[PDB]
Amino acid sequence: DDDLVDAEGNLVEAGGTYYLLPHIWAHGGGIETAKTGNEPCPLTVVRSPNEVSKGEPIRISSQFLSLFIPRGSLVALGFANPPSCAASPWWTVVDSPQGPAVKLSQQKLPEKDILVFKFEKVSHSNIHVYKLLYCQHDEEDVKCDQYIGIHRDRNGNRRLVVTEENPLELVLLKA
Ligand code: NI
């Protein structure tokens, strides 16, 4: 029943702000946004290519009421300071010709659409590192089997998307 642990070994505080950084420093910086396709503002969730950037502060909220996050629980992830055209700060997974992608929405969202993430601890590490799972509807329910990874588009944006191989890994650094 381990609760999530941050980069300094302390429990992640529900609703608190954290920087989602890669385990391997060489993989880039924190998570932020980019404007792609026909988007009116930055509604595409991406990983900063700047290794010194901590990216945007992210709020992690649980499906359960608690001061902490029970790692086996579903979580919603949102930017503490979302772009202007986003209706709310929460990330969602949207279908596309290229496959499911992590985005921000112009629409108000129902809990079932944002409470679709789950952190999965990686065993081979001295600190607490987590892969990020996406959990689609197992209909009245939901199931966490599909991982989140990176896809660099033609312009160099490192978009967070559902991937088959090579899931990203993260450490949660309290802002
Ligand atoms: Ni690793």
From Swiss-Prot:
Q: What does this protein do?
A: Inhibits alpha-chymotrypsin at the molar ratio of 1:2 in state of 1:1.
Q: Please specify the portion of the entire protein covered by the chain, as first and last position out of its full length.
A: 25 to 199 of 207
Q: Spell out the molecular function terms from Gene Ontology.
A: serine-type endopeptidase inhibitor activity
Protein name, as recorded: Chymotrypsin inhibitor 3
Give the UniProt keywords, A-Z: Disulfide bond, Protease inhibitor, Serine protease inhibitor, Signal
Annotated site residue numbers, Reactive bond for chymotrypsin: L65, S66
Q: Which family does it belong to?
A: Belongs to the protease inhibitor I3 (leguminous Kunitz-type inhibitor) family.
Q: List the disulfide bonds.
A: C41-C85, C135-C144
